[PDB]
Amino acid sequence: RNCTIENFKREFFPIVYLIIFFVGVLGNGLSIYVFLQPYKKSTSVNVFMLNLAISNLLFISTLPFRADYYLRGSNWIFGDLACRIMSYSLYVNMYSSIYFLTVLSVVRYLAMVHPFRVTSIRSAWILCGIIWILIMASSIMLLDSEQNGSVTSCLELNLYKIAKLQTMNYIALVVGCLLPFFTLSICYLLIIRVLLKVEADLEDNWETLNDNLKVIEKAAAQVKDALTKMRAAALDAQMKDFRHGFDILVGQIDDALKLVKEAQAAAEQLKTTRNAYIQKYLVSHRKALTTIIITLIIFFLCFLPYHTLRTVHLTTWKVGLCKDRLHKALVITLALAAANACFNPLLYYFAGENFKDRLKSALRK
Ligand SMILES: O=C(O)CCCN1C[C@@H](C(=O)O)Oc2c(NC(=O)c3ccc(OCCCCc4cc(F)ccc4Cl)cc3)cccc21
Ligand SMILES: CC(C)CCC[C@@H](C)[C@H]1CC[C@H]2[C@@H]3CC=C4C[C@@H](O)CC[C@]4(C)[C@H]3CC[C@]12C
Ligand SMILES: CCCCCCCC/C=C\CCCCCCCC(=O)OC[C@H](O)CO
Ligand SMILES: CCCCCCCC/C=C\CCCCCCCC(=O)O
Ligand SMILES: CCCCCCCC/C=C\CCCCCCCC(=O)O
Ligand SMILES: CCCCCCCC/C=C\CCCCCCCC(=O)O
Ligand SMILES: CCCCCCCC/C=C\CCCCCCCC(=O)O
């Protein structure tokens, strides 16, 4: 090991791996504890988040061993099977995470489309199981093949595996990184488009309501006229129960008129119900937009630099050449990719589904 990158590695990896370990145990242990708290309602997004956190915490449990490897001067003492498992756990976590994130963004988009619409929980579990099976079967090759002599080396690129990984990169790069990032980019576009259009419509709706209510507030002959115009507009607008409730408000006001204080007072009750109708949409859009922005940032930080540098490192690799500068850049972006496993609970906190509700419930206990 003549190259200087090895001296860099033996100090750098123990630091970042142990930081990720402790931070990731705290975050994921607490997140999983919160998830499993009983709450009157549950959702498929809770399924996807729980699967992500379990995957991340499993991966995090391997990091003290990798740190040990480097702290011993790059000598593996944990046996051949354990080395195999290091490799396998790294890559299974990474791509299961990428797919759980992609599915989560898609789900939030599809939800913001339908704010008023167990059945989908079992489907969420079925989908998770599909993802696990496909990635675990695609990764078993790592389990097939501690190599070194006079010392025991694990975690190292070497001649024996170079051609193999050159082929596998090709697939994982395309199907495991770039295709999901493409899916995310379309999801961002669609989220922004739908959000802008819906909120423009909602502002128009609220504005016309306040116009009609200001007319009723100012000026009984014209009160009935305004209420009948509003009733006709509402009838043409036909959420059957919601429309019926608003129309019953209108009919109660129009009766209290046709029977000036009671009807004008009843006119205000539409305002709070309309504000609640607006807020339902606004909450769905907040959630979808937060999810997609945090997820794109994770991809730009954790996954795309790593896959880029990894690919070039493999393509230019030669037996008797160090390439210490490219190799150092790769080591750093590998740390970032690993660190995703402690970054993800940010998403549970800022875009969870009754996450804070479950947390406040836990705090009561
Ligand atoms: O420390 C250091 O000096 C630096 C790192 C050395 N080092 C250590 C070495 C090591 O791991 O020991 O790895 C590299 C790789 N590895 C790959 O380029 C790879 C490519 C593909 C791959 O596939 C796993 C299974 C993916 C299954 C899958 C999931 C999907 F979602 C979609 C499609 C598929 Cl197919 C694994 C590694 C590339 C460059 C260097 C190293
Ligand atoms: C992942 C990164 C690269 C995404 C950046 C892509 C840019 C080009 C995206 C982000 C938001 C997108 C816009 C979102 C909304 C609309 C309104 C629609 O009526 C025409 C397209 C238009 C104007 C989109 C054009 C493309 C767009 C500007
Ligand atoms: C909504 C905005 C539009 C969404 C789109 C934004 C995200 C693009 C995603 C993937 C493209 C990846 C393209 C990478 C192509 C590289 C091909 C290449 O460089 O090949 C090198 C060499 O020729 C081979 O051996
Ligand atoms: C992530 C580090 C390496 C992990 C290797 C694979 C471990 C799998 C662990 C947990 C997956 C949980 C499986 C639950 C999904 C099945 C649901 C169903 O079939 O209905
Ligand atoms: C990673 C993100 C890439 C940045 C893409 C830049 C394009 C952003 C375009 C529009 C952002 C719109 C923000 C939402 C405005 C809401 C205001 C309103 O609805 O009244
Ligand atoms: C967003 C970065 C993801 C990974 C980087 C880790 C460090 C980030 C630390 C703090 C970021 C906080 C982002 C909060 C977004 C929520 C905004 C909102 O609630 O509307
Ligand atoms: C809940 C996070 C609040 C942050 C406070 C900082 C210190 C907290 C650290 C560890 C507390 C561990 C909480 C686990 C105990 C179970 C919770 C309960 O009592 O219901």
Coordinates of C-alpha atoms and ligand atoms in Angstrom, one line a residue:
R1 CA 0.0 0.0 0.0
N2 CA 2.5 2.6 -1.2
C3 CA -0.1 5.3 -2.0
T4 CA -0.8 8.2 0.4
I5 CA -4.6 7.8 0.1
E6 CA -4.3 4.9 2.5
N7 CA -2.9 7.2 5.2
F8 CA -5.8 9.6 4.5
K9 CA -8.4 6.8 4.7
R10 CA -7.2 5.4 8.0
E11 CA -7.8 8.7 9.8
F12 CA -10.8 9.9 7.8
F13 CA -13.1 6.9 7.8
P14 CA -13.1 6.2 11.6
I15 CA -14.1 9.8 12.3
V16 CA -17.0 10.1 9.8
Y17 CA -18.2 6.5 10.3
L18 CA -18.5 6.9 14.1
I19 CA -20.1 10.3 13.8
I20 CA -22.7 8.8 11.5
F21 CA -23.1 5.9 13.9
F22 CA -24.0 7.9 17.0
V23 CA -26.1 10.6 15.2
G24 CA -27.9 7.9 13.2
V25 CA -28.7 5.7 16.3
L26 CA -30.2 8.7 18.1
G27 CA -32.2 9.9 15.1
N28 CA -33.5 6.5 13.9
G29 CA -34.0 5.0 17.3
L30 CA -36.2 7.9 18.2
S31 CA -38.0 8.0 14.8
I32 CA -38.9 4.3 15.0
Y33 CA -40.0 4.7 18.6
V34 CA -42.3 7.6 17.5
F35 CA -43.6 5.6 14.4
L36 CA -44.7 2.7 16.5
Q37 CA -46.9 4.9 18.8
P38 CA -50.6 4.3 18.5
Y39 CA -52.6 7.0 16.8
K40 CA -56.2 7.2 15.7
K41 CA -55.2 7.2 12.0
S42 CA -52.4 5.7 9.9
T43 CA -51.2 6.2 6.4
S44 CA -49.1 4.5 3.7
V45 CA -46.4 7.2 4.0
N46 CA -45.9 5.9 7.5
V47 CA -45.2 2.5 6.0
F48 CA -42.6 3.9 3.6
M49 CA -40.9 6.0 6.2
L50 CA -40.7 3.1 8.7
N51 CA -39.1 0.9 6.1
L52 CA -36.5 3.6 5.3
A53 CA -35.6 4.0 9.0
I54 CA -35.3 0.3 9.6
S55 CA -33.0 0.0 6.6
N56 CA -30.9 2.9 7.7
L57 CA -30.6 1.6 11.3
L58 CA -29.6 -1.8 10.1
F59 CA -26.8 -0.3 7.9
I60 CA -25.7 2.0 10.8
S61 CA -25.1 -1.1 12.9
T62 CA -22.2 -2.1 10.6
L63 CA -20.2 1.1 10.9
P64 CA -18.2 0.3 14.1
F65 CA -16.7 -2.6 12.3
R66 CA -15.6 -0.6 9.3
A67 CA -14.1 1.9 11.7
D68 CA -12.3 -0.9 13.4
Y69 CA -10.9 -2.1 10.1
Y70 CA -9.3 1.3 9.5
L71 CA -8.1 1.8 13.1
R72 CA -6.1 -1.5 12.8
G73 CA -4.1 -0.2 9.9
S74 CA -6.5 -1.8 7.4
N75 CA -6.6 -5.3 9.0
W76 CA -9.9 -7.2 9.0
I77 CA -10.4 -9.5 12.0
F78 CA -14.1 -10.3 11.8
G79 CA -14.0 -13.2 9.4
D80 CA -14.8 -13.7 5.7
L81 CA -18.6 -13.9 6.0
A82 CA -18.6 -10.6 8.0
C83 CA -16.7 -8.9 5.2
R84 CA -19.2 -10.1 2.6
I85 CA -22.0 -8.7 4.8
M86 CA -20.2 -5.3 5.0
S87 CA -20.4 -5.0 1.2
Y88 CA -23.9 -6.4 0.9
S89 CA -25.4 -4.1 3.7
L90 CA -23.8 -1.0 2.2
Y91 CA -25.3 -1.5 -1.2
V92 CA -28.7 -2.9 -0.2
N93 CA -29.3 0.1 2.2
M94 CA -28.2 2.6 -0.5
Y95 CA -30.5 1.5 -3.2
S96 CA -33.5 0.6 -1.0
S97 CA -33.2 4.1 0.4
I98 CA -33.1 5.7 -3.1
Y99 CA -36.3 3.8 -4.0
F100 CA -38.1 4.5 -0.7
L101 CA -37.4 8.2 -1.2
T102 CA -38.6 8.1 -4.8
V103 CA -41.8 6.3 -3.9
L104 CA -42.4 8.8 -1.1
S105 CA -42.3 11.8 -3.4
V106 CA -44.6 10.1 -5.9
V107 CA -47.1 9.3 -3.2
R108 CA -47.2 12.9 -1.9
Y109 CA -47.8 14.2 -5.4
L110 CA -50.6 11.8 -5.9
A111 CA -52.1 12.8 -2.6
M112 CA -52.0 16.5 -3.1
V113 CA -54.0 15.8 -6.3
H114 CA -56.8 14.2 -4.0
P115 CA -57.1 16.0 -0.6
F116 CA -60.5 14.5 0.2
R117 CA -59.8 10.9 -0.9
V118 CA -55.9 0.1 5.7
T119 CA -56.8 -0.5 2.1
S120 CA -53.7 1.5 0.9
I121 CA -51.6 0.5 4.0
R122 CA -51.5 -3.2 2.9
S123 CA -50.6 -2.0 -0.6
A124 CA -47.8 0.1 0.9
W125 CA -46.4 -3.0 2.6
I126 CA -46.8 -5.1 -0.6
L127 CA -44.8 -2.4 -2.6
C128 CA -42.1 -2.3 0.1
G129 CA -41.7 -6.0 0.0
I130 CA -41.4 -5.8 -3.8
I131 CA -38.6 -3.3 -3.5
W132 CA -36.7 -5.3 -0.8
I133 CA -36.9 -8.5 -2.9
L134 CA -35.8 -6.9 -6.1
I135 CA -32.8 -5.1 -4.5
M136 CA -31.7 -8.0 -2.3
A137 CA -31.8 -10.4 -5.3
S138 CA -30.0 -7.9 -7.5
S139 CA -27.2 -7.6 -4.8
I140 CA -26.6 -11.3 -3.9
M141 CA -23.5 -11.4 -6.1
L142 CA -21.6 -9.5 -3.3
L143 CA -22.3 -12.3 -1.0
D144 CA -20.5 -14.7 -3.3
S145 CA -17.2 -12.9 -2.9
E146 CA -10.3 -11.2 3.9
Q147 CA -8.7 -11.5 0.5
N148 CA -5.2 -10.3 1.3
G149 CA -2.0 -12.1 2.5
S150 CA 0.2 -11.2 5.5
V151 CA -2.8 -8.9 6.5
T152 CA -6.5 -9.2 6.1
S153 CA -8.0 -6.6 3.8
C154 CA -11.7 -5.9 3.3
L155 CA -13.6 -3.0 1.8
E156 CA -10.8 -2.4 -0.9
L157 CA -11.0 -2.1 -4.7
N158 CA -8.6 -4.6 -6.3
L159 CA -7.8 -6.5 -9.5
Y160 CA -9.9 -9.5 -8.7
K161 CA -13.1 -7.5 -8.6
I162 CA -12.4 -4.6 -11.0
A163 CA -14.0 -6.0 -14.1
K164 CA -17.0 -7.3 -12.1
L165 CA -17.7 -3.9 -10.5
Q166 CA -17.2 -2.1 -13.9
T167 CA -20.1 -4.1 -15.2
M168 CA -22.3 -3.8 -12.1
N169 CA -21.7 0.0 -11.8
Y170 CA -23.2 0.3 -15.3
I171 CA -26.5 -1.1 -14.2
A172 CA -26.7 0.4 -10.7
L173 CA -25.7 3.8 -12.1
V174 CA -28.6 3.8 -14.6
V175 CA -31.3 1.9 -12.8
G176 CA -30.3 2.6 -9.3
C177 CA -29.4 6.3 -9.4
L178 CA -30.1 8.2 -12.7
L179 CA -33.6 6.8 -13.4
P180 CA -34.8 7.7 -9.8
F181 CA -33.4 11.1 -10.1
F182 CA -35.2 11.5 -13.4
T183 CA -38.4 10.4 -11.7
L184 CA -37.8 13.0 -8.9
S185 CA -37.2 15.8 -11.4
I186 CA -40.5 15.1 -13.2
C187 CA -42.2 14.9 -9.8
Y188 CA -40.9 18.4 -8.9
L189 CA -42.2 19.9 -12.1
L190 CA -45.6 18.3 -11.6
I191 CA -45.9 19.4 -7.9
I192 CA -45.0 23.0 -8.8
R193 CA -47.5 23.1 -11.7
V194 CA -50.4 21.7 -9.8
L195 CA -49.7 23.8 -6.7
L196 CA -49.6 27.1 -8.5
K197 CA -52.8 26.4 -10.4
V198 CA -54.8 25.2 -7.5
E199 CA -53.8 28.1 -5.2
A200 CA -54.7 30.6 -7.9
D201 CA -58.2 29.0 -8.1
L202 CA -58.5 29.1 -4.3
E203 CA -57.7 32.8 -4.2
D204 CA -60.4 33.5 -6.7
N205 CA -62.9 31.5 -4.7
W206 CA -62.1 33.2 -1.5
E207 CA -62.2 36.6 -3.2
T208 CA -65.6 36.2 -4.8
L209 CA -66.9 34.9 -1.4
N210 CA -65.7 38.0 0.4
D211 CA -67.2 40.2 -2.4
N212 CA -70.6 38.6 -2.0
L213 CA -70.3 38.8 1.8
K214 CA -69.4 42.5 1.7
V215 CA -72.4 43.1 -0.5
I216 CA -74.6 41.4 2.1
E217 CA -72.9 43.3 4.9
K218 CA -73.5 46.7 3.2
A219 CA -77.0 46.1 1.8
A220 CA -83.5 42.9 2.6
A221 CA -84.8 42.9 -1.0
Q222 CA -81.2 42.6 -2.4
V223 CA -80.2 40.2 0.3
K224 CA -82.4 37.5 -1.2
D225 CA -81.2 38.4 -4.7
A226 CA -77.5 37.9 -3.6
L227 CA -78.4 34.7 -1.8
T228 CA -80.2 33.2 -4.8
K229 CA -77.4 34.1 -7.1
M230 CA -74.9 32.4 -4.7
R231 CA -77.2 29.4 -4.5
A232 CA -77.4 29.1 -8.3
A233 CA -73.6 29.5 -8.6
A234 CA -73.2 26.7 -5.9
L235 CA -75.7 24.5 -7.7
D236 CA -73.7 24.8 -10.9
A237 CA -70.5 24.1 -9.0
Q238 CA -71.7 20.5 -8.3
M239 CA -67.6 16.3 -2.3
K240 CA -71.4 15.9 -2.3
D241 CA -71.7 16.4 1.5
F242 CA -69.5 19.5 1.4
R243 CA -71.6 21.1 -1.4
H244 CA -74.8 20.2 0.5
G245 CA -73.5 21.8 3.7
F246 CA -72.6 25.0 1.9
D247 CA -76.0 25.0 0.2
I248 CA -77.7 24.4 3.5
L249 CA -75.9 27.4 4.9
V250 CA -77.2 29.3 1.9
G251 CA -80.8 28.0 2.4
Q252 CA -80.8 28.8 6.1
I253 CA -79.6 32.3 5.4
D254 CA -82.1 32.7 2.6
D255 CA -84.9 31.6 4.9
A256 CA -83.8 33.9 7.7
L257 CA -83.9 36.7 5.0
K258 CA -87.2 35.8 3.4
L259 CA -88.8 35.5 6.9
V260 CA -81.9 41.3 8.5
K261 CA -79.9 40.6 11.7
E262 CA -80.2 36.8 11.7
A263 CA -79.5 36.3 8.0
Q264 CA -76.6 38.7 7.8
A265 CA -75.1 37.0 10.9
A266 CA -75.6 33.6 9.4
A267 CA -73.8 34.8 6.3
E268 CA -70.4 34.8 8.2
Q269 CA -70.6 31.1 9.0
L270 CA -69.7 30.3 5.4
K271 CA -66.4 32.1 5.9
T272 CA -64.9 29.7 8.5
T273 CA -66.0 26.6 6.6
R274 CA -64.5 28.0 3.4
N275 CA -61.3 28.7 5.2
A276 CA -61.2 25.1 6.4
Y277 CA -61.9 23.9 2.8
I278 CA -58.9 26.0 1.6
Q279 CA -56.6 24.8 4.4
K280 CA -57.0 21.2 3.5
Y281 CA -55.5 21.8 0.1
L282 CA -52.9 24.1 1.5
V283 CA -51.6 21.5 3.9
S284 CA -51.4 18.9 1.2
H285 CA -49.3 21.2 -1.0
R286 CA -47.0 22.2 1.9
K287 CA -46.3 18.5 2.5
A288 CA -45.6 17.6 -1.1
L289 CA -43.3 20.6 -1.7
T290 CA -41.2 20.1 1.5
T291 CA -40.8 16.4 0.7
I292 CA -39.6 17.0 -2.9
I293 CA -37.1 19.8 -1.9
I294 CA -35.5 17.9 0.9
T295 CA -35.2 14.8 -1.3
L296 CA -33.6 16.6 -4.3
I297 CA -31.1 18.1 -1.8
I298 CA -30.3 14.6 -0.5
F299 CA -29.6 13.5 -4.1
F300 CA -27.4 16.4 -5.0
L301 CA -25.4 16.0 -1.8
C302 CA -25.3 12.2 -1.1
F303 CA -25.8 10.2 -4.4
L304 CA -24.9 12.1 -7.6
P305 CA -21.3 13.1 -6.7
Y306 CA -20.6 9.6 -5.4
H307 CA -21.9 7.8 -8.5
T308 CA -20.1 10.3 -10.8
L309 CA -16.7 9.9 -9.1
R310 CA -17.2 6.1 -8.6
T311 CA -17.8 5.7 -12.4
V312 CA -14.7 7.7 -13.4
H313 CA -12.6 5.9 -10.7
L314 CA -13.6 2.5 -12.1
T315 CA -13.0 3.5 -15.8
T316 CA -9.5 4.8 -15.3
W317 CA -8.3 2.3 -12.7
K318 CA -4.8 0.8 -13.3
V319 CA -2.9 -1.6 -11.2
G320 CA 0.3 0.3 -10.4
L321 CA -1.0 3.8 -10.2
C322 CA -2.3 5.7 -7.1
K323 CA -4.5 8.5 -8.6
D324 CA -4.5 9.9 -5.1
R325 CA -6.5 13.0 -5.9
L326 CA -9.4 11.3 -7.7
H327 CA -9.3 8.6 -5.0
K328 CA -9.5 11.2 -2.2
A329 CA -12.5 12.8 -3.9
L330 CA -14.2 9.4 -4.1
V331 CA -13.5 8.7 -0.4
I332 CA -15.3 11.9 0.6
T333 CA -18.3 11.4 -1.6
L334 CA -18.6 7.8 -0.2
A335 CA -18.7 9.3 3.3
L336 CA -21.6 11.6 2.1
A337 CA -23.5 8.7 0.6
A338 CA -23.1 6.8 3.9
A339 CA -24.2 9.8 5.9
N340 CA -27.6 9.8 4.2
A341 CA -28.6 7.2 6.8
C342 CA -28.5 9.8 9.5
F343 CA -29.8 12.6 7.4
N344 CA -33.2 11.1 6.5
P345 CA -35.0 11.7 9.9
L346 CA -35.1 15.4 8.9
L347 CA -37.8 14.3 6.4
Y348 CA -39.8 12.5 9.2
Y349 CA -39.8 15.7 11.3
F350 CA -40.5 18.3 8.7
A351 CA -42.8 16.3 6.4
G352 CA -44.1 13.4 8.5
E353 CA -47.7 12.2 8.7
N354 CA -48.9 12.6 12.3
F355 CA -45.3 12.3 13.3
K356 CA -45.4 15.3 15.7
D357 CA -48.9 14.0 16.8
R358 CA -47.4 10.7 17.9
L359 CA -44.4 12.5 19.4
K360 CA -46.7 14.7 21.6
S361 CA -48.5 11.6 22.6
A362 CA -45.3 10.0 23.6
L363 CA -44.4 13.1 25.6
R364 CA -47.6 12.8 27.5
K365 CA -46.6 9.3 28.6
Ligands
LIG1 O1 -12.3 2.9 0.0 C1 -11.8 3.2 -1.0 O2 -10.6 3.0 -1.3 C2 -12.7 3.8 -2.1 C3 -13.7 2.9 -2.6 C4 -13.2 1.6 -3.2 N1 -14.2 0.7 -3.7 C5 -14.6 -0.4 -2.8 C6 -15.6 -1.3 -3.5 C7 -16.3 -2.2 -2.5 O3 -17.5 -2.1 -2.3 O4 -15.7 -3.0 -1.8 O5 -16.6 -0.6 -4.2 C8 -16.1 0.3 -5.1 C9 -16.8 0.6 -6.3 N2 -18.1 -0.1 -6.5 C10 -18.9 0.0 -7.5 O6 -18.8 0.7 -8.5 C11 -20.2 -0.8 -7.3 C12 -21.1 -0.8 -8.4 C13 -22.3 -1.5 -8.3 C14 -22.6 -2.3 -7.2 O7 -23.8 -2.9 -7.2 C15 -24.3 -3.5 -6.0 C16 -25.6 -4.1 -6.3 C17 -26.6 -3.2 -6.8 C18 -28.0 -3.8 -7.2 C19 -28.9 -2.9 -7.9 C20 -29.8 -2.0 -7.2 C21 -30.6 -1.2 -7.9 F1 -31.5 -0.4 -7.2 C22 -30.6 -1.1 -9.2 C23 -29.8 -2.0 -9.9 C24 -28.9 -2.8 -9.2 CL1 -27.9 -3.8 -10.2 C25 -21.7 -2.3 -6.1 C26 -20.5 -1.6 -6.2 C27 -16.4 1.5 -7.2 C28 -15.2 2.1 -6.9 C29 -14.5 1.9 -5.8 C30 -14.9 0.9 -4.9
LIG2 C1 -34.4 18.9 -10.9 C2 -34.2 20.3 -11.5 C3 -33.1 20.2 -12.6 C4 -35.4 20.9 -12.1 C5 -35.2 22.2 -12.8 C6 -36.1 22.1 -14.1 C7 -36.8 23.4 -14.4 C8 -36.4 23.7 -15.8 C9 -38.3 23.2 -14.1 C10 -38.6 23.4 -12.6 C11 -40.0 24.0 -12.5 C12 -40.6 23.8 -13.9 C13 -41.8 24.7 -14.3 C14 -43.0 24.4 -13.4 C15 -44.3 25.0 -14.0 C16 -44.4 25.3 -15.3 C17 -45.8 25.9 -15.8 C18 -46.2 25.1 -17.0 O1 -47.5 25.6 -17.5 C19 -45.1 25.2 -18.1 C20 -43.8 24.6 -17.6 C21 -43.3 25.2 -16.3 C22 -42.8 26.7 -16.4 C23 -42.2 24.4 -15.7 C24 -41.0 24.4 -16.7 C25 -39.8 23.6 -16.2 C26 -39.4 24.1 -14.8 C27 -39.0 25.6 -14.8
LIG3 C1 -38.1 18.0 -15.4 C2 -36.7 18.5 -15.9 C3 -36.1 17.4 -16.8 C4 -35.7 16.2 -16.0 C5 -34.2 15.8 -16.4 C6 -33.2 16.2 -15.4 C7 -32.6 15.0 -14.8 C8 -32.0 14.1 -15.9 C9 -31.9 12.6 -15.3 C10 -31.1 11.7 -15.9 C11 -30.3 12.1 -17.2 C12 -28.9 11.5 -17.1 C13 -28.2 11.7 -18.4 C14 -26.7 11.2 -18.3 C15 -26.2 10.9 -19.7 C16 -24.7 10.6 -19.6 C17 -24.3 9.7 -20.8 C18 -22.8 9.6 -20.9 O1 -22.1 10.5 -20.6 O2 -22.2 8.5 -21.4 C19 -20.7 8.6 -21.4 C20 -20.2 7.5 -22.3 O3 -20.5 7.9 -23.6 C21 -20.8 6.2 -22.0 O4 -19.9 5.2 -22.1
LIG4 C1 -30.4 -2.4 5.1 C2 -29.1 -3.1 5.5 C3 -29.1 -4.5 4.9 C4 -30.4 -5.1 5.1 C5 -30.6 -6.4 4.4 C6 -32.0 -6.8 4.2 C7 -32.8 -6.8 5.5 C8 -34.3 -6.7 5.4 C9 -34.8 -6.1 6.7 C10 -36.0 -5.5 6.8 C11 -37.0 -5.6 5.7 C12 -38.4 -5.6 6.3 C13 -39.3 -6.5 5.4 C14 -40.8 -6.0 5.5 C15 -41.4 -5.9 4.2 C16 -42.3 -7.1 3.9 C17 -43.8 -6.7 3.9 C18 -44.7 -7.8 3.3 O1 -44.1 -8.7 2.7 O2 -45.9 -7.6 3.4
LIG5 C1 -34.1 21.9 -6.5 C2 -35.0 23.0 -7.0 C3 -34.6 23.6 -8.3 C4 -35.1 25.0 -8.5 C5 -36.0 25.2 -9.7 C6 -36.3 26.7 -9.9 C7 -37.7 26.9 -10.4 C8 -38.6 27.3 -9.2 C9 -39.9 27.9 -9.8 C10 -41.0 28.2 -9.0 C11 -41.0 28.0 -7.5 C12 -42.4 28.3 -7.0 C13 -42.5 28.4 -5.5 C14 -43.9 28.4 -5.0 C15 -44.6 29.8 -5.0 C16 -45.9 29.8 -4.3 C17 -46.6 31.1 -4.3 C18 -48.0 31.0 -4.5 O1 -48.5 29.8 -4.8 O2 -48.8 32.0 -4.3
LIG6 C1 -32.1 20.2 3.8 C2 -30.7 19.6 4.0 C3 -30.8 18.1 4.2 C4 -29.5 17.4 4.6 C5 -28.5 18.4 5.2 C6 -28.3 18.2 6.7 C7 -28.2 19.5 7.5 C8 -29.5 20.3 7.3 C9 -29.9 21.0 8.6 C10 -31.1 21.7 8.6 C11 -32.0 21.8 7.4 C12 -33.4 22.1 7.9 C13 -34.4 22.1 6.7 C14 -35.8 22.5 7.2 C15 -36.8 22.5 6.1 C16 -38.2 22.7 6.7 C17 -38.8 24.0 6.2 C18 -40.3 24.1 6.6 O1 -40.7 23.5 7.6 O2 -41.1 24.6 5.8
LIG7 C1 -37.8 13.4 22.5 C2 -36.6 14.3 22.2 C3 -36.4 15.5 23.1 C4 -35.0 16.0 23.1 C5 -34.4 16.2 24.5 C6 -32.9 16.0 24.5 C7 -32.5 14.8 25.4 C8 -33.4 13.6 25.1 C9 -32.5 12.4 24.9 C10 -32.9 11.2 25.2 C11 -34.3 10.9 25.6 C12 -34.8 9.5 25.2 C13 -36.3 9.4 25.2 C14 -36.8 8.0 25.3 C15 -37.7 7.7 26.5 C16 -39.1 7.4 26.0 C17 -40.0 8.6 25.9 C18 -41.0 8.6 27.0 O1 -40.7 8.7 28.2 O2 -42.2 8.4 26.6

